[PDB]
Design a protein around this nucleic acid. Sequence first.
DNA 1: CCTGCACAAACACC
DNA 2: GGTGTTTGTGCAGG
Length: 85
Amino acid sequence: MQDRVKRPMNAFIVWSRDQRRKMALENPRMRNSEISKQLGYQWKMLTEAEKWPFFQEAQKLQAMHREKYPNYKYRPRRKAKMLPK
DNA sequence: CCTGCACAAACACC
DNA sequence: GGTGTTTGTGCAGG
């Protein structure tokens, strides 16, 4: 059995993990589909200085993630797509 | 050099 | 389980 390595969480995913739970406790009956929309609206209102602390952490998680798997490569699966010429 | 696709995590609903 | 939603990252094509 092989365990697959998941991609490092980006500043928004890390910031949503803790913010998403905050909104769920205050809005435990709101569906993630709507919360995901308000978080994106609120996330776009944060300043770069306020977002910086979350970007640096994602950057640290990415470097630390790279230390665990220094040979890891992002290899997305392509779907059957052929554009006309 | 520029543009677009595929994929990361968490949760209510059917 | 799959559905339905956010933002940000890295690779491939022309």
